[PDB]
Design a protein around this ligand. Structure first.
Ligand SMILES: CC(=O)/C(C)=C(/[O-])SCCNC(=O)CCNC(=O)[C@H](O)C(C)(C)COP(=O)(O)OP(=O)(O)OC[C@H]1O[C@@H](n2cnc3c(N)ncnc32)[C@H](O)[C@@H]1OP(=O)(O)O
Ligand SMILES: CC(=O)/C(C)=C(/[O-])SCCNC(=O)CCNC(=O)[C@H](O)C(C)(C)COP(=O)(O)OP(=O)(O)OC[C@H]1O[C@@H](n2cnc3c(N)ncnc32)[C@H](O)[C@@H]1OP(=O)(O)O
Lengths: 355, 355
């Protein structure tokens, strides 16, 4: 029902970014068929799928895969470079049966280069390009921002942009091509703002000492009386003033907002203020204000938040809450995701796809 | 020269996700025209644009904006809901002159709901949906993962997916629609893996006590003899074994990899090992293997890393390095980004676009 209704996607089962990209395509209405190896999933990622099984190293498995690919718009693979090539499913082999195919290759290091054959995970890819070094408090070793930056923000999301951009190009050229989405590249573009700021003296390599990394007292979390937290993001002077107004602090008795030499003094004063009441008290104080103060909610509490409820950001499906499709479309709205279903026959899909 | 060559984009100047989305469209070949308020640029994010100025609150400014929009494929705006409406540039007004327009609305809270009129920044949007609570060490307050997750991973990247998906739909329907990209939604889909794992007992709400948040000794950073860091991401047993081999540790003398009760003991043993030599020594020892051990590089040293150099992940511009376009395309490759140029006349663009 979403904007991608009619789009045919073959997904070769991997981990991390590949399945996340395939999920989003499915969320938006695409017809996604996932090929897994021999031997109902409880993994909520893998919603909006039809799952088939094939031994891609056997003659029969390779034949059935190529027949499926011959009728597809997009192929997603997330193995080491050379893996699909040795299987007989490389770009050159797929082009022989389908030159309209968008061949989307999801890796961390890319298709070539000295590390291209090296195993890795999110934390490794963001280590090499300056990102991981920049995350965390200054007095401690870097902390991983989960796998949000390599696998997803700079990974699957760039694969998706590539797939959809190539599909636009195809409307005029009539032909597909290969998309090389490397997490080391995508995450670098994701953090382009910092590279831009570094060039103009607006960002430093010192961890925890910048405007957006926790270094600024007006852009950080604060612990409240109940041991829970608020987030403060009051960058602009008018928003910062509203924050001080709600705390009841006289600006004339405080250091200037952007006098960095007195930031520890400013932070201590704000720390004392926020610590004087519980988290939910500050929700009441800052209601309908531009102070940029919000409660820091744990996953388990999210479903009780009015703004979350009223916009249906989540749906409840056997097990727990799951995020609804994003972004949203006014005319061709995405459906509530279909849960994981039982594995079906590969020939049944071919009959449906006319292959 | 990239896959989006020929696509016409009008960007109403904002901050954060909007300009980043417009940048990526420009990177991939789109014709992006940014309208700023009247009042050269040092900001590398404004690469691949033509800059014009108009007072959108004046009769003439509004008229010229609508003329430009009448000839565009995409409009990007990142103001509070209602702002474009008040200007006379709302979706209903734009539809009168161009029903093929993809109207892309970039916000934090979304178009409706109790928080939709409140000012905010990245930290606020990720505070409300469980993300911020999950980032950082367990014995301290949450730390912002810069503005990577709300503004970009869960913001601009979802705006881009929406824009390009809506363009795909337009080929068959003949018309555009409104894309509502809210950072609170996009970032929730970005972290879908955690929502999935929470439902199956594979993730907990306790900060710093899980597999991918720094809780696991095989998925974290370690400080070396020189005070610099390595990242370890050796999740799978064969990769973990390769890491132990490189360290010269006897597996029989260590606790099991996934015995969580003995994780502090395991971490202490690995800490002692990594502390015995400098970062670059471990960089050498693990340069080629599948151990998932990488040096943690600061921004300033990224340009000296062989894998970064040989793949041209970055280019030099205005005294500093900037990331090359991502992802990469085999047939319609993106060009090196054009630097920010001087503001040009709005009528010169209309002559070019025939409007
Ligand atoms: C998730 C998470 O926690 C995090 C935090 C992440 O970052 S996730 C991001 C992680 N990084 C990435 O994703 C980056 C890119 N990926 C990689 O670097 C690797 O895939 C990793 C390292 C992930 C696994 O290494 P690996 O050595 O285990 O796998 P491989 O070298 O790719 O070879 C696969 C083999 O399986 C075979 N096969 C497959 N399907 C079928 C089938 N249906 N039928 C039959 N056979 C099949 C292939 O033919 C192939 O066989 P060979 O060619 O060896 O004879
Ligand atoms: C950046 C960063 O470091 C981080 C970490 C981030 O997260 S970034 C993410 C930040 N979050 C978001 O982006 C989320 C969405 N955005 C927002 O919530 C707000 O835009 C913020 C809060 C960012 C600024 O609040 P605000 O009160 O300053 O702005 P506003 O309420 O939107 O109204 C704009 C006004 O400007 C006028 N104008 C514009 N162009 C022209 C023109 N050419 N000619 C003439 N006039 C023009 C409009 O007509 C309008 O006037 P009114 O209608 O009031 O009379």
């Amino acid at each position: 029902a979403g904007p991608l209704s009619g789009l045919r996607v073959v997904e070769l089962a991997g981990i991390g970014p590949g399945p996340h990209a395939a999920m989003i395509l499915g969320d938006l209405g695409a017809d996604v068929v996932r090929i897994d190896r021999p031997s109902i999933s409880r993994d909520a990622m893998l919603r909006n799928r039809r799952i088939v099984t094939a031994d891609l190293k056997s003659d029969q498995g390779l034949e059935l895969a190529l027949k499926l690919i011959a009728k597809a718009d997009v192929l997603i693979e997330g193995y080491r470079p050379g893996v699909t090539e040795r299987l007989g499913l490389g770009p050159e082999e797929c082009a022989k049966v389908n030159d309209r195919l968008i061949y989307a290759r999801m890796t961390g290091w890319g298709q070539t280069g000295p590390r291209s054959q090296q195993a890795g995970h999110d934390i490794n890819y963001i280590s090499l390009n300056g990102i991981l070094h920049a995350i965390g408090r200054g007095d401690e070793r870097p902390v991983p921002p989960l796998n949000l930056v390599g696998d997803f923000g700079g990974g699957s999301m760039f694969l998706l942009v590539g797939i959809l951009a190539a599909l636009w190009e195809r409307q005029s050229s009539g032909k597909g091509q290969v998309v090389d989405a490397a997490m080391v590249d995508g995450s670098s573009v994701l953090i382009q703002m910092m590279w831009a700021m570094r060039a103009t003296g607006m960002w430093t390599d010192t961890r925890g000492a910048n405007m957006l990394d926790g270094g600024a007292p007006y852009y950080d979390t604060y612990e409240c009386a109940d041991g829970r937290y608020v987030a403060v993001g009051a960058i602009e002077p008018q928003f910062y003033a509203a924050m001080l107004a709600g705390l009841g602090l006289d600006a004339a008795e405080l250091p200037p907002q952007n006098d960095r030499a007195r930031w520890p003094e400013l932070r201590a004063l704000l720390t004392e203020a926020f610590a004087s009441h519980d988290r939910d008290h500050w929700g009441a104080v800052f209601a309908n204000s531009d102070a940029c103060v919000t409660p820091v909610l744990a996953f388990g509490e999210v479903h009780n938040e009015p703004h979350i409820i009223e916009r249906n950001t989540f749906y409840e499906a056997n097990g727990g809450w799951q995020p609804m499709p994003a972004p949203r479309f006014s005319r061709t709205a995405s459906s509530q995701p279909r849960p994981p279903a039982a594995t079906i026959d590969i020939e049944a899909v071919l009959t449906d796809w006319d292959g």
